[PDB]
Ligand binder design. Structure first.
Ligand SMILES: [Mg+2]
Ligand SMILES: [Mg+2]
Ligand SMILES: [Mg+2]
Ligand SMILES: [Mg+2]
Ligand SMILES: [Mg+2]
Ligand SMILES: [Mg+2]
Ligand SMILES: [Mg+2]
Ligand SMILES: [Mg+2]
Ligand SMILES: [Mg+2]
Ligand SMILES: [Mg+2]
Ligand SMILES: [Mg+2]
Ligand SMILES: [Mg+2]
Ligand SMILES: [Mg+2]
Ligand SMILES: [Mg+2]
Ligand SMILES: [Mg+2]
Ligand SMILES: [Mg+2]
Ligand SMILES: [Mg+2]
Ligand SMILES: [Mg+2]
Ligand SMILES: [Mg+2]
Ligand SMILES: [Mg+2]
Ligand SMILES: [Mg+2]
Ligand SMILES: [Mg+2]
Ligand SMILES: [Mg+2]
Ligand SMILES: [Mg+2]
Ligand SMILES: [Mg+2]
Ligand SMILES: [Mg+2]
Ligand SMILES: [Mg+2]
Ligand SMILES: [Mg+2]
Ligand SMILES: [Mg+2]
Ligand SMILES: [Mg+2]
Ligand SMILES: [Mg+2]
Ligand SMILES: [Mg+2]
Ligand SMILES: [Mg+2]
Ligand SMILES: [Mg+2]
Ligand SMILES: [Mg+2]
Ligand SMILES: [Mg+2]
Ligand SMILES: [Mg+2]
Ligand SMILES: [Mg+2]
Ligand SMILES: [Mg+2]
Ligand SMILES: [Mg+2]
Ligand SMILES: [Mg+2]
Ligand SMILES: [Mg+2]
Ligand SMILES: [Mg+2]
Ligand SMILES: [Mg+2]
Ligand SMILES: [Mg+2]
Ligand SMILES: [Mg+2]
Ligand SMILES: [Mg+2]
Ligand SMILES: [Mg+2]
Ligand SMILES: [Mg+2]
Ligand SMILES: [Mg+2]
Ligand SMILES: [Mg+2]
Ligand SMILES: [Mg+2]
Ligand SMILES: [Mg+2]
Ligand SMILES: [Mg+2]
Ligand SMILES: [Mg+2]
Ligand SMILES: [Mg+2]
Ligand SMILES: [Mg+2]
Ligand SMILES: [Mg+2]
Ligand SMILES: [Mg+2]
Ligand SMILES: [Mg+2]
Ligand SMILES: [Mg+2]
Ligand SMILES: [Mg+2]
Ligand SMILES: [Mg+2]
Ligand SMILES: [Mg+2]
Ligand SMILES: [Mg+2]
Ligand SMILES: [Mg+2]
Ligand SMILES: [Mg+2]
Ligand SMILES: [Mg+2]
Ligand SMILES: [Mg+2]
Ligand SMILES: [Mg+2]
Ligand SMILES: [Mg+2]
Ligand SMILES: [Mg+2]
Ligand SMILES: [Mg+2]
Ligand SMILES: [Mg+2]
Ligand SMILES: [Mg+2]
Ligand SMILES: [Mg+2]
Ligand SMILES: [Zn+2]
Lengths: 100, 77, 91, 50, 112
RNA sequence: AUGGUGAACUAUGCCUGAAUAGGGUGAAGCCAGAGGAAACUCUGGUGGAGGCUCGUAGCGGUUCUGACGUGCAAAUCGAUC
RNA sequence: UUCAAAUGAGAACUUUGAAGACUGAAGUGGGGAAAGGUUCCACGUCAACAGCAGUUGGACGUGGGUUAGUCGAUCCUAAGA
RNA sequence: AUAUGGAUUCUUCACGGUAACGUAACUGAAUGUGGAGACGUCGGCGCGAGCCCUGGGAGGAGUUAUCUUUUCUUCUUAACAGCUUAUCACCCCGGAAUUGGUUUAUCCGGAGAUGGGGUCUUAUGGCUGGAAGAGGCCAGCACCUUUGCUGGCUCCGGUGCGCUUGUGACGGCCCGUGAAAAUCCACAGGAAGGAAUAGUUUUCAUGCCAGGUCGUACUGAUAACCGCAGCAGGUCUCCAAGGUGAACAGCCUCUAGUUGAUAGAAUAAUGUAGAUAAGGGAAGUCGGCAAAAUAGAUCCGUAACUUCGGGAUAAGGAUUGGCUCUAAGGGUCGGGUACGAUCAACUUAGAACUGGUACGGACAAGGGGAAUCUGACUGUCUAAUUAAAACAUAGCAUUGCGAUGGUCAGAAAGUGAUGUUGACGCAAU
């Protein structure tokens, strides 16, 4: 009935060219991820961390993989990094930023 | 195009003299609601009908494959 | 709620053909559509199905009658005339 | 058209064969008089009446 | 968005050229020509669709086992059971009345 | 005048097929109700009739006596109908 | 309708890419019936033809292409002959 | 062609069910019979499929100065087979007035209703087999190549006066009642043929062989046909997305397809096609020819006259955007022998606010009224100068004719139409 879903991102390959900093990135998520309306409403219902090489996202609230690819598409857009990094799906529910 | 379920009647089929060739297929499908399990389908091909027997039970699966007549041309997978 | 004063089923022909032709047709239409008594099972289940052919909703007997009415005057009087003449050949 | 008698397919076929340029070697024959092929038809210039 | 074409030469919409649209395993819409429907065999007596019997196009009835073409009573796949009830009674009563008819008129002959 | 060839156009019948948005009207039948001494008379529903109607596609071809009138065309084009 | 490239002796007209539009599923879409008979497809190719052009074409030259027990015919009977 | 298994028989040609009927089988000659083939139209109502719309999720794509858990897109399942699945119809029990059951549409019952329980058709659908191995969508490596290789995901739902189409149970209509034959099956029949030392049985299952001939390309039309032609003509049909809207209308769009039609420069007169005009308002003209005016919808109002059906959108009026609210109209479950819980739908009326008083804002879309003449009406015709008052029609009336006949065809005929006819008829006015 309840359930928590877990979404990972392997930001390694573009972080290790300096050009991607996972500080402001998961930071972006934290206060931009909307929650039944608007930002800041992560009432312990949604959480984010960064495993240095990986950004983790965990949720009990309405949250999809497709959503993730959307917010971060926009980060990648905000800091000019489109062209340079795709958001992609390796195995189901497990994603990663692709450089080259 | 036929489906069989009597494991006996199956074996008899596999030895039916016009039955030169079979083919085992394996499928990952889920169990009830949760986890997965290995499904296997035994397909004897007859002059007219192609019979296929589903052993949902991985064990009855393995023990069935040795029961397969040594002179039957099984195509595994 | 009385829908038409006098055309009745004849209201379909609207204005055309002139009153008196519609009077004549109305009479015989009223005759031909209407449901009749079964001389056999005795339910009023007799409706027409082309001129002179009356059948029975249930019990399914089919009787050959007049063109827009089940029994036609002349027929009936023949029925009585034949009755009569028949008697002459028993007594 | 389209769904054809054998008979017509046959006429059709024969007509194809005759629809070729003079074979240029006849030109070189002693006393050869024939210049071009003067009986050639084009499908959209002359229908061939079955 | 996805349209369809006939599958045989006949371009017109005759009875014998009904279509049915279908989704194939290729993910696409294809046509399929439908045979005219079968109608149910009827009773020789009354005329109802007589039950028990299967309903196929007539030649198909020869590619089908006999039980699909009868019920296990006198006049199986032919007359409508209630219609057999009747003809059985009538048979019985009429043959009786005949006996009644004979000895009555046998009597008529000796005493007159 | 004689002997022949045409119903691929068109006229008519017969056989076998196929085709026609969306609206307007609201005929018989039917249900419930109201008045009245009575005879009987009313009302609201339902229903869905018609060589009915507005109007496409269709089929037509009214007017411009419109275009064209050595044409797109030996009969067409436009608007209107 | 337009920009550019490519090809070519030659490019308003061919090919490609871009742009601007159209038909708007009652289609300028996808198939067929009659009728055509190779028009299909590839390759070559411009003397005539496509009422400007032409490197393009339903043109010219040369080849290739139509696979069924189940789809049609074949059988059946209609008006009819 | 055929054997093997099964089924059947010592009660020889099966059993079971009260019955409707059931089934894997469960002999069947002549002859007879029945069914299928096999059938109009329209109307609403019911259901199926494809489409349309939509939620979650799992992928890929786009926009992101700013806003959008967004926009777009993939998420499929053939014939065939097994079980299952139905409106109708039928059976068994039962015996009904306080009549009941009941459709949107009033029909049904002592010739047995309501009720409870059964039987059947298998349209249709579900699940499974076919069948994920296919197809669809992605990701990660490889290298001139043929081109590979490896991974995943391919899931679960919702909505209905939707659209197209199929079908069903009905209902309207007829002086119209809406093919034939091949072919298949079933029944009535019982000729004959069959077992215990072993018989029948190929309508049950499984197995064996074979299936000729001809067509099969493409166009199907503003260039593949007919019009002397790559002619603005003509020429039978099927499939059919989104919005606005009553809609297959017009206008805009996705898919697909086009972007073909000599070109350049100017913008005189005169034209062809499209428009507007002060004040007047038909004075123009043979004549309001052309043109303009009108128009949707909701509401209000509506004359003469009439065959009472009409006349009628008569006439004559008001109103209409946006935005923000109010109210009414439905479904699904458990209640011992009053109500609550939840889901999903645009209609209609009312009320505020708001604007250069605009709002069927493009598109779409009737001018009305009073008379005379004349045909009743719908319908017909001079293809290519006449669409009318002409023809037709129903209605009326007249004539001929009982078959050895009326009317009519033929050179003749053992010839033919009416005639599958018979005066409520055929023929002639
Ligand atoms: Mg789609
Ligand atoms: Mg075809
Ligand atoms: Mg049966
Ligand atoms: Mg059955
Ligand atoms: Mg018997
Ligand atoms: Mg003709
Ligand atoms: Mg039809
Ligand atoms: Mg309509
Ligand atoms: Mg009273
Ligand atoms: Mg109507
Ligand atoms: Mg009309
Ligand atoms: Mg009209
Ligand atoms: Mg209207
Ligand atoms: Mg309209
Ligand atoms: Mg027209
Ligand atoms: Mg007409
Ligand atoms: Mg005109
Ligand atoms: Mg003129
Ligand atoms: Mg001129
Ligand atoms: Mg018009
Ligand atoms: Mg050009
Ligand atoms: Mg457009
Ligand atoms: Mg349109
Ligand atoms: Mg074109
Ligand atoms: Mg041609
Ligand atoms: Mg070509
Ligand atoms: Mg040249
Ligand atoms: Mg040419
Ligand atoms: Mg030229
Ligand atoms: Mg030239
Ligand atoms: Mg050539
Ligand atoms: Mg060639
Ligand atoms: Mg066939
Ligand atoms: Mg043959
Ligand atoms: Mg048995
Ligand atoms: Mg028979
Ligand atoms: Mg019959
Ligand atoms: Mg038929
Ligand atoms: Mg099939
Ligand atoms: Mg029941
Ligand atoms: Mg019972
Ligand atoms: Mg409804
Ligand atoms: Mg249709
Ligand atoms: Mg009928
Ligand atoms: Mg039958
Ligand atoms: Mg004998
Ligand atoms: Mg057999
Ligand atoms: Mg083809
Ligand atoms: Mg084609
Ligand atoms: Mg073309
Ligand atoms: Mg031509
Ligand atoms: Mg010619
Ligand atoms: Mg043309
Ligand atoms: Mg095209
Ligand atoms: Mg031109
Ligand atoms: Mg010019
Ligand atoms: Mg003025
Ligand atoms: Mg004035
Ligand atoms: Mg005046
Ligand atoms: Mg004057
Ligand atoms: Mg004058
Ligand atoms: Mg005058
Ligand atoms: Mg005018
Ligand atoms: Mg004005
Ligand atoms: Mg008036
Ligand atoms: Mg308002
Ligand atoms: Mg409410
Ligand atoms: Mg008030
Ligand atoms: Mg008239
Ligand atoms: Mg008229
Ligand atoms: Mg004329
Ligand atoms: Mg003339
Ligand atoms: Mg006229
Ligand atoms: Mg005229
Ligand atoms: Mg008169
Ligand atoms: Mg003679
Ligand atoms: Zn009766």
């Amino acid at each position: 009935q309840k359930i928590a879903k877990t979404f990972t991102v392997d930001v390694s390959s573009p972080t290790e060219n300096g050009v991607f900093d996972p500080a402001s990135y998961a930071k972006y998520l934290i206060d931009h991820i909307k929650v039944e309306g608007a930002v800041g409403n992560l009432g312990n219902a949604v959480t984010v961390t960064e495993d240095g090489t990986v950004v983790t996202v965990v949720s009990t609230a309405k949250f999809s993989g497709k959503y993730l690819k959307y917010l971060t598409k926009k980060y990648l857009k905000k800091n000019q990094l489109r062209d340079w990094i795709r958001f992609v799906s390796t195995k189901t529910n497990e994603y990663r930023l692709a450089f080259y | 195009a036929r489906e069989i379920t009597d494991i006996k009647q199956f074996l008899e089929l596999t030895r039916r003299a016009d039955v030169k060739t079979a083919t085992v297929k394996i499928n990952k499908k889920l169990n009830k609601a949760g986890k997965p399990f290995r499904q296997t389908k035994f397909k004897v091909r007859g002059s007219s009908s192609l019979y296929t027997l589903v052993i949902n039970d991985a064990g009855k699966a393995k023990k069935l494959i040795q029961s397969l007549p040594p002179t039957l041309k099984v195509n595994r997978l | 709620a009385k829908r038409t004063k006098k055309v009745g089923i004849t209201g379909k022909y609207g204005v055309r053909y002139g009153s008196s032709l519609r009077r004549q047709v109305k009479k015989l239409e009223i005759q031909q559509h209407a449901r009749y008594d079964c001389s056999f099972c005795g339910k009023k289940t007799v409706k027409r199905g082309a001129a002179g052919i009356w059948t029975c909703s249930c019990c399914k007997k089919t009787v050959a009658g007049g063109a827009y009415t089940v029994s036609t005057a002349a027929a009936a009087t023949v029925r009585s005339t034949i009755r009569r003449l028949r008697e002459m050949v028993e007594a | 058209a389209a769904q054809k008698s054998f008979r017509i397919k046959q006429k059709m076929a024969k007509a194809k064969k005759q629809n070729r340029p003079l074979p240029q070697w006849i030109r070189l024959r002693t006393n050869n008089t024939i210049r071009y092929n003067a009986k050639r038809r084009n499908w959209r210039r002359t229908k061939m009446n079955i | 968005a996805q349209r369809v074409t006939f599958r045989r030469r006949n371009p017109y919409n005759t009875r014998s050229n009904k279509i049915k649209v279908v989704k194939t395993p290729g993910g696409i819409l294809r046509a399929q020509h439908v045979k005219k429907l079968a109608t149910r065999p009827k009773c020789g007596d009354c005329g109802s669709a007589l039950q028990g019997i299967s309903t196929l196009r007539p030649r198909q009835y020869a590619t089908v086992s006999k039980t699909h073409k009868t019920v296990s009573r006198a006049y199986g796949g032919s007359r409508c059971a209630n219609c057999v009830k009747e003809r059985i009674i009538r048979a019985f009563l009429i043959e009786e009345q005949k006996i009644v008819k004979k000895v009555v008129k046998e009597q008529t002959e000796a005493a007159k």
